[model samples]
Target: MMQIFVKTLTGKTITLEVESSDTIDNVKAKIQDKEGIPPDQQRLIFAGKQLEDGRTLADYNIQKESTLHLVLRLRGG
Candidate 1:
């Protein structure tokens, strides 16, 4: 398993344990459970690219111990 850092715009960092084979949607679900954010509302980014759903971490070439940016989707603006 790999531990990836999810950095938020709020200056908060949440570390998550995940496998390279794990899908982005799966990781978002994990954050939903831990941070109370819904999977549909999350955008995961790494290596200057936006990580897409239904895709494995390995697909994005994400490395172990690397950080992923988490941008939350705002509603009713």
Candidate 2:
């Protein structure tokens, strides 16, 4: 198991327990649970790279105790 840190756009921080097999989407789901943001409204960035739903943290060189920061995509004014 690994401890992953998720920081929301609203300045909320959550720590989740996850396994190596968990995908980036799984982390987004957990963030949605804590921050009340829908999965479709979330965007994740890890190690200066944007991650997709099908990609796992491991694919981005993320290991145990890694931290991910979330940002909300802005639309045109």
Candidate 3:
């Protein structure tokens, strides 16, 4: 297990326990649990790039303590 830092839209930093094998979508699920936002309603960004659903954390070479930015999503727009 590794610790990953998530930057919330409210300018808060949160820590999550995860593995490099985890997908970005899986990360969204974690965010959902934390913020009450639906899984599909999360827009995660890291390293100045928006996270793609199918990509694994390892795919982005995200290491322990890496920071991810979380943005809200609109249901349909």
Candidate 4:
């Protein structure tokens, strides 16, 4: 298992234990569990890239022991 660091927009941070087989969607789910952000509103940031729910970290070559930062996208400008 690998550990990843996720930071929310509210300055909340969470460390997640993830497997190599885990997908980006899984990361989103974990974020939702920790930050109480709905699935529809969750967004992920890693390697200075923003990812969508349909995309996976694997697609970006992210593997175990990787640290990913998450930023919530609010509907207000």
Candidate 5:
């Protein structure tokens, strides 16, 4: 399992263990489960790249102990 460190703009952090084969969407789901920041409302970033809805961690070359940045998506306008 690869370890990922997620840092949020909302003053919180989370650690997750997952497969490199796991989709980015899965990670968002995890954040929603653990942090109450729904998957549709999560903007996840890793390294210098923004994560796409249909991609896997390996596609971004996410490493163990890698840090991801998060910005909460606003509702409506």
Candidate 6:
């Protein structure tokens, strides 16, 4: 297991246990559990690129302790 650091605009850093094989969509789901934000509303960016839901973390060369920024898409509640 690797530790992924997810940082939000609110200055919160969430640490998640994950594998390199895990897809971005899976990461979103995990974020939902911790933050109560729906997966569809979450946008994850790392290394100046937006992460694709279908792609694995390894596809973006994410390693242990790598940090990802989280942005929430605007939506009407």
The prediction achieving the highest lDDT against the true structure is 6
Q: Write the per-residue lDDT of candidate 6 for residues 1-77, one digit (tens) a residue.
A: 56788886566778887777877787777778777888877898787878786588788777888898988889786
Write the number of the candidate with greater lDDT, choosing between 5 and 6. 6
> Which residue ranges in model 6 land beyond 4 Å of their true spot?
none
What are the clash counts of all predictions, listed in order? Answer: 0, 0, 0, 0, 0, 0
- Best of the candidates, TM-score: 6
| Model 5: per-residue Cα lDDT at residue 47 | 64
> Residue-wise lDDT of candidate 2 within 41-69, one digit each (tens)?
68887767678865766667776667788
The C-alpha TM-scores of every prediction are: 0.78, 0.79, 0.81, 0.67, 0.81, 0.84
> Higher lDDT: candidate 1 or 3?
3
RMSD of 1: 2.0
**Which wins on lDDT, candidate 1 or candidate 5?**
5
The digit string of per-residue lDDT tens for model 5 on 1-77 reads 57888786655678877778877787777778767877777888666667787587778877887888877778676
* Ten residues in sequence with the least summed lDDT for candidate 5: 45-54
For all predictions, the C-alpha RMSD in Å is 2.0, 2.4, 2.0, 2.8, 1.9, 1.5
The TM-score between candidate 5 and the true structure equals: 0.81
Report the C-alpha lDDT of model 4 over 18-52, residue by residue, as the tens digit: 66556767777788887777767777777788766
Global lDDT for candidate 3?
A: 0.77
lDDT of the candidates, in the order given: 0.75, 0.75, 0.77, 0.69, 0.77, 0.79
Worst 10 residues of 2 by lDDT: 56-65
Give the CA lDDT, 0 to 100, for residue 41 in model 2: 65
Give the C-alpha lDDT of model 2.
Answer: 0.75
